[PDB]
Amino acid sequence: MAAKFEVGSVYTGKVTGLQAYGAFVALDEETQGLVHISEVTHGFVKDINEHLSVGDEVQVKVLAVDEEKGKISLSIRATQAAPEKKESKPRKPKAAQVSEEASTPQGFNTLKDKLEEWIEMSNRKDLIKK
Numbered sequence: 397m398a399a400k401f402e403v404g405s406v407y408t409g410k411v412t413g414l415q416a417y418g419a420f421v422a423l424d425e426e427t428q429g430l431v432h433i434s435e436v437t438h439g440f441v442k443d444i445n446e447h448l449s450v451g452d453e454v455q456v457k458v459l460a461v462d463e464e465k466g467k468i469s470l471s472i473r474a475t476q477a478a479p480e481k482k483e484s485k486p487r488k489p490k491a492a493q494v495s496e497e498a499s500t501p502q503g504f505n506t507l508k509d510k511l512e513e514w515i516e517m518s519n520r521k522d523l524i525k526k
Contacts, residue, residue, distance in 0.1 A: 397463060397464060397465050397466040398426060398463065398466050399427075399461050399462075399463040399466060400424075400426070400427065401423070401427060401458050401461055401468060402458065402461065403458055403459065403460060403461060404457070404458060405457070405458040406455060406456070406457050406458070406474075406475060406478075407423055407455070407456060407458070408453065408454070408455045408456070409421045409422050409423040409424075409429075409453070409454060409455075409456055410422050410451070410452065410453050410454070411448060411449060411450050411451060411452050411453075411454055412428065412450070413450055414444050414445060414448060414449075414450050415444070416433070416444070417432065417433050418430045418431050418432045418433050418435075418436070418444070419431040419433075419436060419444060419448045419450075419472075421454060421456055421470055423456070423468065426466060427466055427468065428466070428467065428468075429456065429458075429467060429468030429469060429470040430467065430468070430469060430470060431448070431454075431456060431470040431471060431472050432459075432469060432470075432471075435459065435469075435470065435471035435472060435473055435474070436448055436472050436473065437472070437473050437476070438473050438477075447472075448472065454472060454475075455475045456470040456471065456472060456474075456475060457470065457471040457472075457474035457475055458470065459471050459474075501515050501516065502514065502515065502516070502517070502518050503518070506518070
């Protein structure tokens with residue numbers, strides 16, 4: 397068929413399917429590859445939908461190329477492990493949110509156990525005691 401990529405390269409594409417053995421990703425109008433499930437995440441890939449999403453954009457590492465069909469074997473554990481530019485990008489704002497980013501209802505972050513009770517109230521400061 398054709399090829400225009402090489403092993404060890406890294407490029408960005410969109411997920412075109414998920415399977416019990418891997419995720420299809422379109423890289424280009426002329427190139428489409430397969431993140432193998434063993435390459436979606438480092439281990440404990442209990443189900444692929446817990447680790448990838450169809451109809452989403454992903455950056456993939458080229459593991460192998462198959463010019464016979466223009467297929468490519470891909471990784472995502474490679475790219476999720478890699479660093480990136482620590483600057484804003486269009487979806488870093490996480491505009492899909494519909495609530496405040498608070499970890500708890502009682503305050504922005506209020507993790508506890510000794511008073512893991514109430515929902516819109518908390519104990520006063522100890523200074524309440526006179």
